[PDB]
Design a protein around this ligand. Structure first.
Ligand SMILES: Cc1cc2nc3c(=O)[nH]c(=O)nc-3n(C[C@H](O)[C@H](O)[C@H](O)COP(=O)(O)O)c2cc1C
Length: 362
């Protein structure tokens, strides 16, 4: 067994390879998109994870696409997150903040001024997002057609990521994870399906990856490369965003570029929740030889698969999502081969303590 052995992850050392995947739970306070004491308790319960990766967190107000998702742009958000990171650290844990801009997976009613959200191109996501009704309950609503970002707006987006990373450092996070996956803004630029731009930010893979690499460079400069991770979902289709007709070659291009920056980790979300083709070992070897930091695998992993791939030298750690929702002490349960608590999906999004902090430890 290697799941319970330490791993250096950039600036920190994880005591095990069982990571908590980023999980949107939509329990923040509105107005203000403010983390809560309840959220602090939830993360503190899970502090035995080798690394906690937070729920996706807005870099700016414009970044918002879901009612109840937190931000890391305002003073009140920074103050609230400081308490959460302090609670994890009090339990000897480590926590990364996942930073996103939702782009076109959003609704005008939660954008600044009630205006259309932004994207690479003016193409509707053709999906739904989660808003809140008059009683504060989560509801699903069709996405608003976005406005294409103007060329002169792109530096502002890069700056918002830079500033959110500075804020993350002050808030006490150990690392940041850039959300470059699952059809959100960075992936909207990466994918030919969502990017029809004819400037230097669309067309070729070099142009499509330009934004995310500008963001990586800005955040490495702001903090340090050994504090930066990135999540990608570059093989398959995710929330209607595919990866184009040359997905493998394009993925390897992006990974080679990321490696040049010497960042802490590469987190691969391998399949959508609705499933997808498995990664071949040949593709895993190609990824492995191109990236010199930690590789985290995710997507319906079992402990057995994690051990198999870690043992083969193809990945270093595994992020578990739904098992971490239901099992605060997942590390101890996997180590002891204990049964897991059953999942209650109806309370994954929104609500309060029920289905959030009420899954017992052993
Ligand atoms: C309720 C829920 C919320 C999620 N929120 C996020 C998120 O904020 N960021 C992200 O990158 N992935 C998100 N995902 C994907 C998970 O990080 C994870 O990759 C996925 O659940 C597959 O892993 P699992 O089979 O271990 O649950 C979410 C998944 C679920 C079920």
């Amino acid at each position: 067994e290697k799941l319970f052995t330490p791993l250096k992850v950039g600036a920190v050392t994880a005591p095990n390879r069982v990571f908590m995947a980023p999980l949107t739970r939509l329990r923040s306070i509105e107005p203000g998109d403010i983390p809560t004491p309840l959220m602090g308790e939830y993360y503190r319960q899970r502090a035995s994870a080798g690394l906690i990766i937070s729920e996706a967190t807005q870099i700016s107000a414009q970044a918002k696409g879901y009612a109840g998702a937190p931000g890391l742009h305002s003073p009140e958000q920074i103050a609230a997150w400081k308490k959460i990171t302090a609670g994890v650290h009090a339990e000897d844990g480590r926590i990364a903040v996942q930073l996103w801009h939702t782009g076109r997976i959003s609704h005008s009613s939660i954008q600044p001024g009630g205006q259309a959200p932004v994207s690479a191109s003016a193409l509707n996501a053709n999906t739904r997002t989660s808003l809140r009704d008059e009683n504060g309950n989560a509801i699903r609503v069709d996405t608003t057609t976005p406005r294409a970002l103007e060329l002169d707006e792109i530096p502002g987006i890069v700056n918002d990521f830079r500033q959110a990373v500075a804020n993350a450092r002050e808030a006490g996070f150990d690392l940041v994870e850039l959300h470059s996956a699952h059809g959100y803004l960075l992936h909207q630029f990466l994918s030919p399906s969502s990017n029809q731009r004819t400037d230097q930010y669309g067309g070729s893979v070099e142009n499509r990856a330009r934004l995310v690499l500008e963001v990586v460079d800005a955040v490495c400069n702001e903090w340090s490369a050994d504090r930066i991770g990135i999540r990608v979902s570059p093989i398959g289709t995710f929330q209607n965003v595919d990866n184009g007709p040359n997905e493998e070659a394009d993925a390897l291009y992006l990974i080679e570029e990321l490696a040049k920056r010497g960042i802490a980790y590469l987190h691969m979300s391998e399949t959508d929740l609705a499933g997808g083709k498995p990664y071949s070992e040949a593709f895993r070897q190609k990824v492995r030889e191109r990236f010199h930091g930690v590789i985290i695998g995710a997507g319906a992993y079992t402990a057995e698969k994690a051990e198999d791939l870690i043992g083969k030298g193809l990945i270093d750690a595994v992020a578990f999502g739904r098992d971490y929702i239901a099992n605060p002490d997942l590390v101890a349960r996997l180590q002891k081969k204990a049964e897991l608590n059953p999942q209650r999906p109806e309370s994954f999004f929104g609500g309060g303590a029920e289905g959030y902090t009420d899954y017992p430890s052993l």
